[PDB]
Amino acid sequence: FVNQHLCGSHLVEALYLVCGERGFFYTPKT
Amino acid sequence: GIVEQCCTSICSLYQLENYCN
């Protein structure tokens, strides 16, 4: 799932699955 | 940032993990 263009909800969902219990930060404005 | 690396170019696990806490 990771090795493609991931945008919007699709990117958030990838971060969720990869990061697991660590959680993550989503900062599209940088 | 993440959009440039993973949305407008092809994402990778290495780069995604840069955004895990």
Swiss-Prot record, chain A:
Changing H10D: In HPRI; Providence. This is Insulin B chain. It comes from Homo sapiens.
